[PDB]
Amino acid sequence: MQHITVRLPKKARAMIVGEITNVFKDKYPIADKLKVIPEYDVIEQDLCKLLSPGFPKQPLRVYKFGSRITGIGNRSSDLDLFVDIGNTFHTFEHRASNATVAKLRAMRKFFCDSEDWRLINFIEQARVPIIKTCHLPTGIECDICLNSMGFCNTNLLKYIFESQPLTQYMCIYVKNWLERCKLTEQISTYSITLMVIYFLQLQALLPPIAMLQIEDAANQAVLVGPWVVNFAQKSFSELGLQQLKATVPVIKGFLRNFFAYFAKFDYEHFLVCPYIGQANVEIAKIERMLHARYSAYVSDNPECSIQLKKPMVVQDPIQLNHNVTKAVTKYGLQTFVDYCQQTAELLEE
């Protein structure tokens, strides 16, 4: 029923009307602490010990990433691990290749046989196939992949969150909001993180990612396939962006404005575009605004262009052909919009 608002779930409502301090009192210090704990070194070492014998002629490196590493995790969060066997970091796979699937299938057996690991699921169909497994000595659930792109995203978020901590507080809040709204099947934590980033770029509080990726005499791209995955780690002082101290009042006001903005966004004509970082980025124009490697990649691979004929378009700022909200349905978008509207209303002073 499109003429009736979807009602905000009571689990979300109680948290929104509740003091925002309660949101963070335990959550931010926990998330900060979980960026680095000694358990992760045990996991990394155990993973290398387990898998190295099985790939004895190749270099092996483990890259940890995800919400724990960026600073928005909690004690139940999974740890994402990219296992790079044979210098595959710089190889881009739109859909996993046969050779990648074969490596993942071989790795599954190691976790299966090992007493130190419980195999939870082997997810082969996914866009990013993963092994979900529990590291039993620590009890931390680990998502093992063979794709470097999520790790690259994590390093960009770390820079963003460390430079402008308001972003981190906002992302902790909206992650919890998504969960209480029961929206995570359609809108991921990473998708709403990119929405927070884009919103703050419009406030001149974060740089466009394209700005951080100028290719000139002093700066060369790190490429994963056609994607530029590095960025200049410029101080915000040098970028001319102010660095705010996140207080409860500042956070609440930015959250109010965030939800109001996405309640009234025109998803039919515009996309959320942290690459460009400017207002009103048109769906009709975005593909002509990307770097030349995007055009060359899609020219050679026309089935791999960004999916724009979708209710909700949120573009990954590194993997520019990925609409991270491509699975949002018309009703799912209406639900999100209605929840944003009601949340902004409840955050008014």
Residue numbers in the entry: 201 to 549
Which sentences from the paper describe this structure?
Terminal uridylyl transferase (TUTase) is one type of enzyme that modifies RNA molecules by facilitating the post-transcriptional addition of uridyl ribonucleotides to their 3′ ends. Recent researches have reported that Drosophila TUTase, Tailor, exhibits an intrinsic preference for RNA substrates ending in 3′G, distinguishing it from any other known TUTases. Through this unique feature, Tailor plays a crucial role as the repressor in the biogenesis pathway of splicing-derived mirtron pre-miRNAs. The structure of Tailor contains two canonical globular domains separated by a large catalytic groove, which serves to accommodate the 3′ ends of the target RNAs for the post-transcriptional addition of uridyl ribonucleotides.
The overall architectures of Tailor in all models are almost identical and resemble the previously reported structures of the other TUTases, belonging to noncanonical nuclear poly(A) polymerase of the DNA polymerase β superfamily. The catalytic domain (CAT) of Tailor consists of a mixed five-stranded β-sheet (β1–β5 strands) packed tightly by two α-helices (h2 and h3) from one side, exhibiting a typical folding of the DNA polymerase β family enzyme. Three conserved catalytic aspartic acid residues (Asp278, Asp280 and Asp 343) sit closely with their side chains all pointing outward from the other side towards the groove. The central domain (CD) of Tailor, on the other hand, is made up of a long α-helix (h1) and a core region of six closely packed α-helices (h4–h9) which is a homologue to the central domain of PAP. The juxtaposed CAT and CD are physically connected through the linkers of h4–β5 and h1–h2. In addition, a highly conserved loop, which has been previously termed as nucleotide-recognition motif (NRM), also exists in the CD of Tailor. Although the overall structures of Tailor in apo and RNA-bound forms are highly similar, careful comparison did reveal a structural perturbation, upon the RNA binding, occurring on a region next to the exit of RNA-binding groove, which is mainly constituted by H294 and R295 from the loop connecting h2 and h3 (L23), R327 from SSL loop, as well as N521 and K525 from NRM loop. Specifically, in RNA-bound structures, the portion of L23 loop (H294 and R295) and SSL loop slightly shifted towards each other upon the RNA binding, forming a direct hydrogen bond between the side-chain of R295 from SSL and the main chain atom of Q325 from L23, which is not observable in the apo-form structure of Tailor. In addition, the side-chain of H294 forms two direct hydrogen bonding interactions with Q519 and N521 while H294 also forms three water-mediated hydrogen bonds with N347, Y500 and N521 using its main chain atoms, in both complex structures. All these H294-related hydrogen bonds were not observed in the apo-form structure of Tailor, reflecting a higher degree of rigidity for this region in the RNA-bound structures, which is consistent with its B-factor profiles in three models.
